[PDB]
Amino acid sequence: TSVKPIFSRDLNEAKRRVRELYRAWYREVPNTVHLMQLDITVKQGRDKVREMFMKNAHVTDPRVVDLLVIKGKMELQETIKVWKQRTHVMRFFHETETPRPKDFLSKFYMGHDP
């Protein structure tokens, strides 16, 4: 315990920042899908944003959340600024890779080490 704060003193304040970033991304998804001529649906993309913002829903510690948005914000800048060519963005969608089943029987049938 006894840990020095990074940007917010408590999860509460931290959550404020997450809200802002969500908004940011939400407002940005449409633009990217157009400035990168990505073949995705704005709605679809916006769900992806939600996915990511929740993939890390479990974090309880304030310090970890603050870094997470710092990092998140940085990603936003890149996307918003065309620095990230489509190849970079679409990677988020994991479009080419073949999905792996998580069913035990499925894995048994395919891989030595599951």
Partner: protein
């Protein structure tokens, strides 16, 4: 002023590891034993934690060994058992520590074997 958190530093969310290799990878914290071949003990000093071994299929074109597991060759070295356990907890890898086993003191004396009695 400092803030209070009872949450075990878990930073699994910042490390940047694919989900599969954080929830299916068991690492063992062990002090390396000594190849019986040599009698030196300088490689049995520091604790090491090693990730579980994974597939090593033969390559069809040249017959070279091929591996799909990124964390295979990685063995991190930690000076003390407590510190190594900490690394597993904050990185979220499962751990199964093995106690160091050091050679027991053995009493030796050149005179003793010269004893015809025994």
């Amino acid at each position: 002023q400092l803030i209070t958190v009872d949450e075990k530093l878990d930073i699994t969310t910042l490390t940047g590891v694919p989900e599969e290799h954080i929830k299916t990878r068991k690492v063992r914290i062990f002090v390396p034993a000594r190849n019986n071949m040599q009698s030196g003990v300088n490689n049995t000093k520091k604790w090491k934690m090693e990730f579980d071994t994974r597939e090593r299929w033969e390559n069809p074109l040249m017959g070279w060994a091929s591996t799909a597991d990124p964390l295979s060759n990685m063995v991190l070295t930690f000076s003390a058992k407590e510190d190594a356990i900490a690394f597993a907890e904050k990185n979220g890898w499962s751990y199964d520590v093995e106690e160091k086993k050091v050679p027991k003191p053995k009493s030796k004396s050149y005179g003793a074997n010269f004893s015809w009695n025994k």
